[PDB]
Amino acid sequence: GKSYPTVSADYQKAVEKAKKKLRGFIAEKRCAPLMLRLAWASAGTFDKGTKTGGPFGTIKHPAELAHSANNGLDIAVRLLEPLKAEFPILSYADFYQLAGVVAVEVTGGPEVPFHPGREDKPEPPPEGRLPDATKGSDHLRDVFGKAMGLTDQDIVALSGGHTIGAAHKERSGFEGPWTSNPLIFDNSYFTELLSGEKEGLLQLPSDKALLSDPVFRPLVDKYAADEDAFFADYAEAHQKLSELGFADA
Ligand code: HEM
Ligand SMILES: N=NC(=O)c1ccncc1
Ligand SMILES: N=NC(=O)c1ccncc1
């Protein structure tokens, strides 16, 4: 359903150069997870019915950073500002999504296709669209399905993003990494989810909800057994997420 906009040769040169610079920066700074979170929080506010929110640069706005779900993302925005300044031609919208794509790549994840052309929109969406970590399958479908317009498969695959990073008690209140290798992008999230609670490792109620849902569970099983399958489905889902409301959604 996508019709991507034309951008100038200079714009595409900048995308390519920014991609390289983001790789070096994100790797050096060890901030891939935070950058993936930033891209996800930018995109996850999309409401299909109204065509509001989504990956349009609004996360840099103090008002959106102030959303409780976005605690700590001001760090991400600040970290990227010097780099972004080297690429004045790029939208913040594109830049943040590019950072998310690079975050997955540099941690060993699939190469998520990237298309430029998102415009920076003036108004952040209303607070409260990002999912609540204490809720379950019904809530996930409301947020990802009814609002964003993503599939059940996309929900499980994208939850796999927690294969990198950690929660922080000063941000969400939850604490610690989901995996033994929080800077490595692999299918370990699903492996850990299946094996039960292991000390030192996090499972949110929202993660656990995948285990009991009739549709989500076989996908968890699939991804734990087949990392290639996870990578394919993850790449598809991340692309869709990064393009919500963009070039038709
Ligand atoms: C399925 C619904 C989701 C819920 C309920 C959820 C909830 C959370 C919470 C509570 C945190 C911890 C924030 C903190 O304390 O630092 C977190 C972190 C994170 N989330 Fe999710 N999230 C969801 C989906 C996603 C998606 C779709 C992605 C990307 C594909 C993602 C990527 C991340 C990453 C990489 C971190 C770690 C950030 C860091 O290490 O600083 N999450 N999430
Ligand atoms: N969570 N904070 C970070 O990712 C970070 C912040 C500043 N410098 C390096 C990394
Ligand atoms: N309180 N909610 C959160 O911290 C959060 C929710 C969804 N994704 C990342 C972070």
Side-chain angles (χ1 to χ4, degrees), residues 203-227:
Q203 295 187 14
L204 305 171
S206 57
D207 299 310
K208 293 182 196 196
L210 307 178
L211 291 170
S212 61
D213 185 79
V215 179
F216 300 152
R217 183 44 180 280
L219 286 156
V220 169
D221 288 345
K222 178 174 84 156
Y223 299 151
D226 187 348
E227 177 174 284

Side-chain angles (χ1 to χ4, degrees), residues 32-34 36-37 40 71 131-133 140 144 155 158-159 161-162 164-169 171-174 178 204 206 234 238 241:
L34 189 64
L36 179 50
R37 193 190 156 203
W40 142 245
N71 280 351
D132 177 338
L140 296 170
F144 287 84
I155 296 169
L158 291 173
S159 294
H162 290 159
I164 64 169
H168 308 74
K169 68 194 178 297
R171 296 180 197 162
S172 64
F174 293 99
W178 287 263
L204 305 171
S206 57
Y234 182 88
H238 189 315
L241 173 73

Side-chain angles (χ1 to χ4, degrees), residues 15-149:
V15 170
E16 284 314 297
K17 266 199 55 169
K19 185 173 175 193
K20 297 188 181 57
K21 293 274 298 217
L22 281 161
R23 282 168 178 152
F25 181 78
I26 292 173
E28 196 281 326
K29 204 74 55 169
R30 313 174 67 67
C31 59
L34 189 64
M35 293 310 159
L36 179 50
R37 193 190 156 203
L38 181 73
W40 142 245
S42 295
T45 59
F46 187 68
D47 182 70
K48 66 194 194 195
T50 61
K51 295 180 181 169
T52 55
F56 302 104
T58 62
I59 197 76
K60 82 184 169 177
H61 292 39
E64 187 164 346
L65 288 171
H67 298 175
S68 64
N70 289 337
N71 280 351
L73 286 181
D74 65 321
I75 303 171
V77 169
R78 179 200 86 213
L79 281 173
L80 295 180
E81 206 53 53
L83 249 197
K84 174 62 188 73
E86 302 185 12
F87 303 99
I89 206 167
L90 298 180
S91 63
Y92 280 84
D94 277 356
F95 195 78
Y96 291 157
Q97 291 310 310
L98 189 53
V101 161
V102 168
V104 173
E105 193 197 78
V106 300
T107 57
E111 291 165 20
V112 177
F114 179 80
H115 295 92
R118 298 161 186 74
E119 292 170 14
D120 287 331
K121 292 178 191 192
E123 55 220 299
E127 184 173 357
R129 296 185 176 177
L130 295 176
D132 177 338
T134 66
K135 298 180 179 303
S137 290
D138 177 80
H139 181 243
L140 296 170
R141 287 192 176 95
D142 285 347
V143 173
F144 287 84
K146 295 193 176 277
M148 288 178 245

